[PDB]
Design a protein around this ligand. Structure first.
Ligand SMILES: *[C@@H]1O[C@H](CO)[C@@H](O)[C@H](O)[C@H]1NC(C)=O
Lengths: 352, 85, 254, 85, 51
């Protein structure tokens, strides 16, 4: 019994796709091997995503692994939910109950809020964007309403001088504490703008909210003098991760691009663990004596009324029942498909 | 023209608290200073006493680093005492 | 002689009625529009995609419809790629989207201007999901600039089953924070529920100030809260004193 | 214990009105009397001034026979003047 | 005050009026002596004007 899975990699996903291929090679049983069908597309575009998903579906894929933007996400959740096609993804968690979707990324809300309480922040500033969604914003707003926080919400995704302005009024109001909730790129940008006008001076505390804190370059503010705190999904001291890096740092840049680095992006690591999860899931499918093989041709995804394959539901369950140890830590999901039992490292940037 | 002790009180507590948010983490040491800022902004019946004395005392005797919010929230309902002497 | 798309969310009735009335009123001898209506769950992206393609393949010249905060990207993207014009009363887009004609005017400026008018340094803001957090993000930014103290409370994640109890609870906390001034940003239905709960716990008496962030304000039933004694302010997109609107109501009410 | 000027104000207005509803049609003539009852009940910082002076004056300058309710409702938000001098 | 002769047509306005005069009398304390239905009417009108 073979198995065919579709993939979707945004343009610029090079290292991610690399770790995908590495996960493909590393996790391989002789009885069956996954059959990736790769599609490069612009993920921010809903039409492109619709078309790619239908292209995979009609090709008779058992499961799909991919990414989504704040735009395309609803298209993915709705189409998966309608056609009963499982979707694995490193992309940001969804706010709500979405069936036939497995979100590899852990929810950051709890960690963040608990950290805010930890540093005892009664009042602070929050710089967000619209990229990964406003769920976190709603969270900090509600928790602020309950705990009587003075939080200042500023969307930095729609925008140089303005930054100087906001940091000026912050300096006058004496709010040092800031939370950056943004894309890696946006974070880098904001930090650059901080250093240029010298708001990285002593007395400031920054909280970077993302699982990527060490995955990016922290070298710029390292000498800044301001306290910085972050989140880490992958512990590089773990033997699993240690051996992974051991094999990863020795890879040829020719075959797998961006592989020769000593570290790896959390999205990429999640891609690898995603490969693991699909492998173990289908392993549990063939080991339980339930044959998954597609009854009829998938057909036209648009064909009305919809035509979901019933047996595919099993596959969904098979995924959600998976419990394994990957790079990201202990991996287990709930009925809705959200990560459960995850451990998030709390980091801090110091002189050393 | 018209000066009300009540409105002066609300203004007092508010300006103290609004001041203490500039000094966050150092608040316990700045309570008195911020109180004088409130006294001088909202005005007082007696320059010596300030806008609300009882509030100042309660706060100075409670406020701890990063404890501001709860401290103010518990001290603003206190009796101002006597505004004259 | 022209065929246009008719996407209507399930439960859209008065809207479709006014659509047919506009069809009869504006249909000339030169040509008549030939609507193909599709009723569907607009919140479902798949359904909207499928319906839109169903309209497209029939060779529709333009489409008129609605969208949710979910389906909107599917519509904007599909219209922009397939070059199909889309007209709609639904909420404006937070960016510049081609091949979309948004019938609804932008309310942000109006709202902020009203907040500035009443001189609100501190108030409460009740938002939910549907109309987007865009207005909320706006009022939050402007609050950051003008030093307003906004209290953001999501009323949309509150189930119809447990709603009364939680409303009384949050409004209790609101009373405790001493916030009289409140802004309701939601559909007419949510507004009615919230107002009902306000009257029930008697927050509609004098000293309280409410601002409805809906564009109708006269479209819902406010007569119950009218005699409470609390100030209420709103926005109106349809002026009932205009002769056009007057005669329209004359034919419409009959 | 500690006495608050604000709480004393609320008590003042309340006790005045509660007294004035005892006298009807003559209210305008008994306003001062009822004020001294509120002053002596709720206490004052200065016996001469009373609990809220501005309130007393506002009432004396407003209250008409059977005009009580509206007079009180318009006079209780007025500034107390000053409890000391 | 007899509330039983109150016309069903004019009842709302008459109630608003009556409670207005009661407000002038400064009467918070009220005794409703009526049938269950009449009581419900009176209470409804009390809540509408926020008494
Ligand atoms: C696993 O997750 C569930 C969900 O909260 C929790 O009840 C349980 O305690 C977790 N186990 C560990 C070891 O954290």
């Amino acid at each position: 019994n073979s198995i065919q899975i579709g993939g979707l990699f945004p343009r610029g996903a090079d290292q991610e796709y690399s770790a995908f291929r590495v996960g493909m090679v590393q996790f391989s049983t002789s009885e069956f091997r996954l059959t990736p069908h790769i599609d490069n597309l612009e993920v921010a575009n809903s039409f492109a995503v619709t078309n790619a998903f239908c292209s995979q579906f009609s090709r008779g894929v058992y499961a799909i692994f991919g990414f989504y933007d704040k735009k395309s996400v609803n298209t993915i959740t709705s189409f998966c939910g309608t056609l009963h096609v499982s979707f694995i993804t490193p992309s940001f968690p969804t706010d709500g109950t979405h069936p036939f979707v497995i979100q590899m990324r852990p929810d950051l809300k709890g960690a963040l809020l608990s950290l805010i309480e930890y540093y005892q922040w009664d009042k602070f500033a929050y710089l967000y964007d619209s990229d990964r969604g406003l769920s976190t914003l709603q969270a900090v707003l509600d928790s602020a309403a309950e705990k009587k926080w003075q939080v200042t919400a500023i969307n930095v995704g729609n925008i140089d001088e303005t930054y100087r302005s906001l940091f000026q009024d912050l300096e006058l109001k004496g709010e040092r504490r800031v939370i950056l909730d943004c894309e890696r790129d946006k974070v880098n940008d904001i930090v650059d703008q901080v250093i240029t006008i010298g708001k990285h001076v002593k007395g400031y505390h920054y909280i970077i909210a993302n699982l990527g804190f060490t995955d990016g370059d922290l070298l710029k503010i390292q000498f800044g003098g301001a306290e910085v705190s972050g989140f880490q999904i992958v512990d590089y001291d773990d033997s699993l991760v240690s051996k992974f890096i051991e094999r990863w740092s020795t890879l040829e840049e020719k075959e797998y691009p961006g592989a020769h680095t000593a570290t790896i992006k959390y999205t990429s690591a999640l891609t690898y663990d995603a490969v693991q999860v699909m492998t173990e899931a289908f392993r549990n499918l063939r080991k339980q004596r339930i044959e998954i093989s597609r009854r009829g041709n998938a057909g036209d995804c648009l064909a009305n009324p919809a035509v979901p394959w019933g047996q595919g539901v099993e596959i969904e369950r098979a995924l959600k029942q998976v419990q394994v140890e990957g790079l990201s830590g202990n991996i287990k999901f709930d009925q809705n498909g959200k990560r459960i039992n995850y451990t998030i490292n709390i980091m801090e940037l110091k002189t050393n | 023209g018209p000066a009300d002790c009540c409105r002066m009180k609300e203004c007092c507590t508010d300006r103290v608290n609004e001041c203490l948010q500039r000094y966050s983490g150092r608040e316990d040491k700045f309570v008195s200073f911020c109180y004088q800022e409130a006294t001088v902004t909202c005005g007082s019946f007696n320059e010596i006493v300030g806008c609300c004395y009882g509030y100042q005392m309660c706060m100075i005797r409670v406020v701890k680093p990063n404890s501001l919010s709860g401290a103010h929230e518990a001290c603003k309902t206190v009796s101002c005492g006597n505004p004259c002497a | 002689s022209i065929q246009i798309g008719g996407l209507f969310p399930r439960g859209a009735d008065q809207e479709y009625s006014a659509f047919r009335v506009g069809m009869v009123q504006f249909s000339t001898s030169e040509f008549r529009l030939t609507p193909h209506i599709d009723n569907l769950e607009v919140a479902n992206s798949f359904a909207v995609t499928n319906a839109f393609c169903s309209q497209f393949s029939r060779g529709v010249y333009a489409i008129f419809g609605f969208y949710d905060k979910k389906s909107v990207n599917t519509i904007t993207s599909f219209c922009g790629t397939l070059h199909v014009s889309f007209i709609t009363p639904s909420f404006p887009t937070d960016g510049t989207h081609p091949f979309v004609i948004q019938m609804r005017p932008d309310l942000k400026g109006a709202l902020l201007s009203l907040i500035e008018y009443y001189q609100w340094d501190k108030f409460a803001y009740l938002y939910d999901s549907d109309r987007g957090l865009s207005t909320l993000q706006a009022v939050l930014d402007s609050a950051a600039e003008k030093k307003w103290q906004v209290t953001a409370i999501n009323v949309g994640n509150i189930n119809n089953d447990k709603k009364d109890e939680t409303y009384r609870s949050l409004f209790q906390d609101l009373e405790l924070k001493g916030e009289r001034r409140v802004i309701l940003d939601c559909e007419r239905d949510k507004v009615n529920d919230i107002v009902d709960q306000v009257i029930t716990i008697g927050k509609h008496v004098k000293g309280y100030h409410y601002i409805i962030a809906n564009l109708g304000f006269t479209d819902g039933d406010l007569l119950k809260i009218q005699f409470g004694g609390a100030e209420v302010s709103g926005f109106q997109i349809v002026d009932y004193d205009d002769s056009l609107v007057s005669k329209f109501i004359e034919r419409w009410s009959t």
